[PDB]
RNA sequence: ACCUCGGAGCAGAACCCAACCUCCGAGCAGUACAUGCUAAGACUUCACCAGUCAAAGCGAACCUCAAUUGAUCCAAUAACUUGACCAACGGAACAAGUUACCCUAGGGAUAACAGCGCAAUCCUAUUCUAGAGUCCAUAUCAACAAUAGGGUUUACGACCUCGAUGUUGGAUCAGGACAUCCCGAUGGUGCAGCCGCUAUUAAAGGUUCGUUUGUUCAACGAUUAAAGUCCUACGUGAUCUGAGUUCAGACCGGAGUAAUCCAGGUCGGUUUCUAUCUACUUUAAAUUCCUCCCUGUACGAAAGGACAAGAGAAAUAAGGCCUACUUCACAAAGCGCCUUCCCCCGUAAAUGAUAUCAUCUCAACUUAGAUACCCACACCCACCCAAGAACAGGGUU
RNA sequence: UCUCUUACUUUUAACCAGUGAAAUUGACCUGCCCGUGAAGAGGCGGGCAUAACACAGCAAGACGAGAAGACCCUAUGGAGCU
RNA sequence: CCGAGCCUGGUGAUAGCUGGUUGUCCAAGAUAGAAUCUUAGUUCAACUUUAAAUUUGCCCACAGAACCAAAUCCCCUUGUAAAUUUAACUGUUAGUCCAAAGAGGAACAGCUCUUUGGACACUAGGAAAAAACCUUGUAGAGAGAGUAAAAAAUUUAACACCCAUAGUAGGCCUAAAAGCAGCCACCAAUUAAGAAAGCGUUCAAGCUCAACACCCACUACCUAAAAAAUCCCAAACAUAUA
RNA sequence: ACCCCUAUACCUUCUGCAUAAUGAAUUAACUAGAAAUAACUUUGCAAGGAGAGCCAAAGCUAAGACCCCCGAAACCAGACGA
């Protein structure tokens, strides 16, 4: 019979070769996740539809920021087949109140605080 | 249908795609390693015996000779006391090559036969040979001198 | 000449389907995406004990706002200007 | 009598070798209702270490076991719970020896 | 050419976040800037909303971490305050 | 056969969970006589009804069991209480058969025909080599078993159709497959010859007439070169038949109290359609037997007894035509006469490499290995015609 | 009757003139093969075919027309009979 | 149109059954079950709709749930925004395929019966047409763009050469069992041959295989079908940088 | 205008209809949702409301807003018919 899936804990135990392939640093983890929906909830269980609504990923290809906390990661682990998780990177730091109107997320996953629309 | 059928059941297409994607891929060598790069001691004692004893050694090509004929020829040479030693070439040739009567080397190809004896009773050997025309008396070497067939005949009369 | 018995893709005897290359390249692509998801969910910033209560005020206050709306339902005000304005459906020039 | 894949049906021994027994044992195996092969101790060990060598030598990043146990792409929606332990080598009563 | 554009960081759709979609379409011929376009106004509002969520989740987590710290130091304070109030006598 | 209640599995771990699913039981018994009274909080058989547990308190003392059951009204009784195998067990207070003499409303939600799915049954092929075949698995036949197909039967299912998809045989006209009955070509033989058996290839052509049965089939008579197996809505009833079968009448035996019935027999019993659309309505290469000769030759101990090559003589089919017969009579016909022309592939050999022999070769290679019809075209009013439904066509010197 | 059917006459028929119905009809610009599909296709897929339009003939199909199946099942629908 | 005439009336008989049911536009919305002369219906529940009131509802973590597998229950965080209750009702209560766990049947069915979950009775793209498989869902205009699913691959069977005398017709056993019907032993001579592995003899006799020699060297790919009925079925193509 | 590309009439019925399931030639006219108990909304007045009767521990008075059409075989009464 078709049920929910308990994913073994080993899958989320990462290897050093995994680190060099996807450069991320085990010490100093990244804080915020850019999650985008890249597959449908049709032809899928109702509980996976409920999690996509809870995570706010009802529209496909629209990026959402979430916390890299153990509770959110548990939900993203029931919908990991219908999404893409990238780390949110911050080159020039966190936006300020004088800078909140000139931000852009970019496909690299990098919230830049100064968008100018001018060649470098 | 039930999970266990008498026939191979048709899978779901996603399971088919899963099987195709998870097929086994063998390791491929880069430069193809195909393209990349006993009784002989006893027999050595016996050849050392036929060469460090009997003074007369005679090589004859081992012609087919049906059993009765092989046996009869042997009893006659036994009378004049001559031994019919049939020893393999793959042990015999390199021994000749390093034990110095190496001029018998281009002679021991094909089927061969050693007629040896301390007594050089070559005349009786000859009488026999000529009774059987299809036998050569290839050659040999008496008193450590390499001789041809005609030399054997000369040192016979 | 070749008819599949019954309906083609259901039943005991189906029309056989085979996997092309692009079908496999599509499945392989979705597999690499899911593996990168497995890694970025392998380094939790916080621990459960460290996040035990860090959002309680925001969540409680949001539910208090929802209660505020669902409690503040009531019929709208009525106006004598709205009632007396209907008299203008007979406003002639002269 | 129910027989599963990997069970010895008959065993023979004595002052004989595998060729001698292998002739009529392959005959009987062929007439058996499932797939069956005449095997020796050495050939059984060689088959098992060949399967282990193939599993270790596989150059495909994607295995049935990995995808199934991780529910990669939501594939448990087309799989069976017994496939988590069968690992794609068994499909009903049929064993597939070429799967790793 | 979506994968190539992603490899250069320039979105995947050329109608996404670049100058070709975000610069003004026109201006008055004398040179006055045109009023802002409606889609660009909606995009800037949504980008503000995203950035404001980035600041909040960071500062909610960055506040929860220090709260956990300031709780464990109090627990270790009430574990290190172990002075025996009266003095041992008896078989000593 | 079952219909209510309980335990176990299916239903492995909170609950729940179906089948004319697999098993086992119940329709009580025993004790007590506070088996009194009362009252928080709960459970609950997926609703309701009904069912279950219970602290504290008053009063005393100092229930086992799994199911072991039955509502309302009404009846009985002074009262407390007590009444259904109401077992179709949520129970109508009390009502059976039969209908082909039948009727109505519906149903392809559901059977009979046909189609479709399926292949248990049925049929075929291969693999395996026990066994039979004097000996010898493999000339021939073949067990236990395995692998595949086929879709002719009997079934199973209930998916189209019950505001109709008419039926068994037969007639007529047949289209197709080949798993070949005959005619062709070939390989094996437990092939001397004549006959056979068996396998490969072949679907151009052909595949009889009768007695009985309604009959498919079957038996029998006489033939034949042979008297194929199937599919086609068990091909084909707006082409036919109606013996059977399938309404109303009747008889025999049987069943039933009878009405009436029998998956038994028997006699009788209305077969409509003026064609709108689709499609179709003249596409010249024939097969087979027999006789003589080869020849009493080959072959064979004999008895028996060929194949080629050659000549004729028919039969059928296709096309045509009246000279004479015959039906007849300016003509149409057959019972009469005339004509009728290619191959066909399974294999068997030579040379010769891979693999310096050999080897027919998914090696390069060599050999066995159509013509004829038709064909010009505003003389046309009209007349004639061997031309013709009309129209067209031929002739009119 | 049939082997085995042929000939002629009359009716019908066809053409001309007069008169002039009926069932039927969602709309049709209404082809063949294989496949598909509510499981048997003019209309769907792949192929093929294909200027237009009368008259005569035919009955393979339009699950052809007719008759809200006579058979079977159902209905807390009828009726006759015992 | 007599299994019971016809006409009028009661009569607008009754019909859990078929058929029918008339302007525009938006929105929410798919069915666990129990009773029932009931299963072609109804009533209650559930689900669905509207309006009100209030506070939590879903997802979830340690701890926790019995003796004789996948999972669930419970559940704070957290991510979210729903839930319960009150009032008022209708309609649905004749279900199909796919994946999975089972059951019945033939480990038959487009078969039947449950359960968990899809999808369909809603849109669009794909899988030839196409319900139920895959991609994808919230609607308009555009002669812009990036994508999603998405196109079947396979072709098989050559295998040596050369040689062979003999203790004995080992014994027993037998009519005879001579390497070879069966039994016991399995030595032994030659450079090198089993008291013989297969074949063949009534038994004999025979010819192969294992052994000599010989020599380049055992060359050694370890695999395997075919059938039906109107007419095969896209046309084609091995070689220009994913 | 055609040619090119795309596109399986409608209604009913159903698990599911291009269906070869139902109905329909077409035009014009005719031809099918009736009301209570409550609830809700909006006025009036308010411990009372209503033009006797009745309700009332915020009610009472008034209004608005919701419940189809055709069809049997039958049964009975009285006449009319040999
Ligand atoms: C055609 N015939 C053989 C027939 C057959 C059946 N049915 C069967 O026998 C069963 N057939 C099945 C099983 C359904 C395939 C039949 O059922 C009938 C009939 C005949 C009819 C005659 C009817 C007729 N009317 C309607 C024109 C008539 O004039 C009379 C009459 N007596 O006046 C009838 O009897 C008649 O109505 C009638 O009863 C018939 C059938 O019942
Ligand atoms: Mg089909
Ligand atoms: Mg087998
Ligand atoms: Mg309850
Ligand atoms: Mg107590
Ligand atoms: Mg009952
Ligand atoms: Mg009951
Ligand atoms: Mg009768
Ligand atoms: Mg049906
Ligand atoms: Mg049938
Ligand atoms: Mg035998
Ligand atoms: Mg069946
Ligand atoms: Mg059914
Ligand atoms: Mg019918
Ligand atoms: Mg009809
Ligand atoms: Mg054939
Ligand atoms: Mg028929
Ligand atoms: Mg017909
Ligand atoms: Mg007729
Ligand atoms: Mg009748
Ligand atoms: Mg009569
Ligand atoms: Mg037509
Ligand atoms: Mg002749
Ligand atoms: Mg040669
Ligand atoms: Mg006229
Ligand atoms: Mg009609
Ligand atoms: Mg369709
Ligand atoms: Mg068709
Ligand atoms: Mg049609
Ligand atoms: Mg016509
Ligand atoms: Mg009809
Ligand atoms: Mg009817
Ligand atoms: Mg009727
Ligand atoms: Mg009823
Ligand atoms: Mg009744
Ligand atoms: Mg009645
Ligand atoms: Mg009358
Ligand atoms: Mg009525
Ligand atoms: Mg909606
Ligand atoms: Mg009852
Ligand atoms: Mg009932
Ligand atoms: Mg009913
Ligand atoms: Mg959208
Ligand atoms: Mg309508
Ligand atoms: Mg139906
Ligand atoms: Mg149909
Ligand atoms: Mg229709
Ligand atoms: Mg239909
Ligand atoms: Mg009909
Ligand atoms: Mg109907
Ligand atoms: Mg009108
Ligand atoms: Mg009555
Ligand atoms: Mg009278």
Domain presence at residue E50: yes
CA distance E46 to A95: 15
CA distance D65 to A11: 12
CA distance D5 to D38: 14
- Bases along strand I below 7 A from a protein CB: 41-43
Domain presence at residue E20: yes
Tokens representing residue D8 in the block: 């010895």
Residue with tokens 């001029």: B103
Neighbours of chain C (3+ CB pairs under 8 A): A, B, D, E
Q: Is C16 on the interface with B (CB under 8 A)?
A: yes
Least CB–CB distance from D74: residue in A8, A11, A81? A81
CA distance D58 to B26: 6
Domain presence at residue E92: no
- Domain coordinates in residue numbering, chain A: 1-117
Burial B61-70 (b: 16+ CB within 10 A, else e): ebeebeeeee
Nearest to B136 by CA among B58, B66, B61, B77: B61
Tokens representing residue E12 in the block: 């995947």
Identify each DSSP E strand in B11-134 by its residue range: 56-59, 83-85, 114-117
Helices B67-79 & B122-131, crossing angle to 10 degrees?
160
Domain presence at residue E49: yes
Query: Mutate which of B19, B24, B26, B28 to test chain D, going by most D C-beta atoms within 10 A?
Result: B24
What is the domain extent for residue E67? 1-85
CATH number of B1-157: 3.30.70.1730
Q: Which alpha helices (DSSP H) does chain E contain, by range?
A: 2-7, 19-22, 38-80
CA distance A30 to A86: 10
- Inter-chain CB proximity A31 and E22 less than 8 Å: no
Tokens representing residue E87 in the block: 């003095």
Neighbours of chain E (3+ CB pairs under 8 A): A, C
Number of compact structural domains in chain E: 1
CA distance E68 to E63: 9
CB B120 within 8 A of CB B132: no
Judging contacts by C-beta atoms under 8 Å, the chain D residues touching residue C29 are none
- Inter-chain CB proximity A66 and E57 less than 8 Å: yes
CB atoms within 10 A of CB E56: 12
Least CB–CB distance from D57: residue in B11, B19, B26? B26
- The DSSP output letter for E62 is H
- Find the B2 Cα to ligand 10 centroid distance in Å: 26
Mode of pairing for the β-strands spanning B145-147 and B56-59: unpaired
Tokens representing residue A13 in the block: 């135990």
Q: Which residues pair with A89 in a beta bridge?
A: A110
- Bases along strand G below 7 A from a protein CB: 34-39
Which of helix, strand or coil describes residue E51?
helix
- Bases along strand F below 7 A from a protein CB: 116-119, 127-129, 144-147
| Longest alpha-carbon distance in chain C | 90
Burial B9-21 (b: 16+ CB within 10 A, else e): ebeeeebbbbbeb
Determination technique for this entry: cryo-EM
Tokens representing residue C92 in the block: 């002639």
- Inter-chain CB proximity E68 and C49 less than 8 Å: yes
Phi-psi label, residue D6: left if phi above 0, alpha if psi -120 to 50, beta otherwise = left
Domain presence at residue E64: yes
- Scan residues 21-80 of chain C and list those with Cβ within 7 Å of strand I: 75, 78
CA distance B118 to B121: 9
Give whole-number Cα distances, A2 to A5, A110, D67, D78, in Å.
9, 40, 17, 9
Task: Point out residues after which chain B has a gap (C–N over 2.5 Å).
Answer: 37
- The DSSP output letter for E84 is -
Q: Which residues pair with B117 in a beta bridge?
A: B56
Nearest to B20 by CA among C24, D69, D74, C17: C24
Give whole-number Cα distances, D87 to D12, D96, E3, in Å.
32, 11, 34
CA distance A80 to D73: 8
Mode of pairing for the β-strands spanning A64-67 and B56-59: unpaired
Residue with tokens 């007629």: B115
Burial C73-84 (b: 16+ CB within 10 A, else e): eeeeeeeeeeee
Judging contacts by C-beta atoms under 8 Å, the chain D residues touching residue B22 are 60, 62-64, 67, 88
- The DSSP output letter for B85 is E
3-state secondary structure labels for all residues of C32-67: HHHHHHHHHCCCCCCCCCCCCCCCHHHHHHHHHHHH
């Amino acid at each position: 019979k078709f049920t929910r899936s308990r994913i073994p804990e080993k899958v989320f135990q990462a290897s050093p070769e995994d680190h060099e392939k996807y450069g991320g640093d085990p010490q100093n983890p990244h804080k915020l996740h850019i999650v985008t929906r890249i597959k449908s909830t049709r032809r899928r269980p109702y509980w996976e539809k409920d999690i996509i609504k809870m995570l706010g990923l009802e529209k496909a290809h629209t990026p959402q920021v979430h916390k890299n906390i153990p509770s959110v990661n548990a939900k993203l682990k029931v919908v990991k087949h219908l999404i893409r998780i990238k780390p949110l990177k911050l080159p020039q730091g966190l936006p300020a109140e004088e800078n909140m109107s000139n931000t852009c997320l970019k496909s690299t996953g990098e919230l830049v605080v100064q968008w100018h629309l001018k060649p470098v | 249908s039930k999970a266990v059928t008498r026939h191979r059941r048709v899978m779901h297409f996603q399971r088919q795609k899963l099987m195709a994607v998870t097929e086994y891929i063998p390791p491929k060598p880069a430069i193809h390693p195909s393209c990349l790069p006993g009784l002989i001691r006893l027999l050595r004692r016996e050849i050392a015996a036929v060469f460090q004893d009997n003074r007369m050694i005679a090589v004859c090509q081992n012609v087919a000779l049906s059993a009765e004929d092989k046996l009869l020829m042997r009893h006659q040479l036994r009378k004049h006391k001559i031994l019919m030693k049939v020893f393999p070439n793959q042990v015999l040739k390199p021994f000749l090559e390093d034990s110095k009567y190496q001029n018998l080397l281009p002679l021991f190809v094909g089927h061969n036969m050693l007629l040896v004896s301390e007594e050089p009773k070559v005349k009786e050997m000859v009488r026999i040979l000529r009774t059987v025309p299809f036998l050569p008396l290839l050659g040999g070497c008496i008193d450590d001198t390499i001789l041809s067939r005609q030399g054997f005949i000369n040192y016979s009369k | 000449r070749g008819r599949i018995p019954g309906r083609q893709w259901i039943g005991k005897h189906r029309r056989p389907r085979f996997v092309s290359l692009r079908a496999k390249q599509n499945m392989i692509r979705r597999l690499e995406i899911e593996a990168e998801n497995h890694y970025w969910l392998s380094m939790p910033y916080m621990t459960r004990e460290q996040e035990r209560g860090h959002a309680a005020v925001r969540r409680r206050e949001a539910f208090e706002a929802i209660k505020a709306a669902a409690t503040s339902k009531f019929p709208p005000h009525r106006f004598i200007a709205d009632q007396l304005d209907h008299l203008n459906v007979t406003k002639k020039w002269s | 009598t129910p027989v599963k894949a990997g069970r010895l049906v008959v065993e023979m021994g004595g002052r004989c070798e595998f060729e001698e027994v292998q002739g009529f044992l392959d005959q009987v195996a062929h007439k058996l209702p499932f797939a069956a092969k005449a095997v020796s101790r050495g050939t059984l060990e060689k088959m098992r270490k060949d399967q282990e060598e193939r599993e270790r030598n596989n150059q495909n990043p994607w295995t049935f076991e990995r995808i199934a146990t991780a529910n990669m792409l939501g594939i448990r929606k087309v799989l069976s719970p017994y496939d988590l332990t069968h690992k794609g080598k068994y499909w009903g009563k049929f064993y597939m020896p070429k799967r790793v | 050419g979506g994968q190539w554009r992603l490899q250069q960081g320039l979105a995947a759709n050329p109608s996404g976040y670049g100058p070709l979609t975000e610069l003004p379409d026109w201006s008055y011929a004398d040179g006055r800037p045109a009023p802002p376009m409606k889609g660009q106004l909606r995009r800037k509002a949504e980008r503000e909303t995203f950035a404001r969520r980035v600041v909040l989740l960071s500062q909610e987590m960055d506040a929860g971490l220090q709260a956990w710290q300031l709780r464990q130091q109090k627990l270790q304070e009430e574990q290190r305050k172990q002075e025996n109030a009266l003095k041992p006598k008896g078989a000593s």
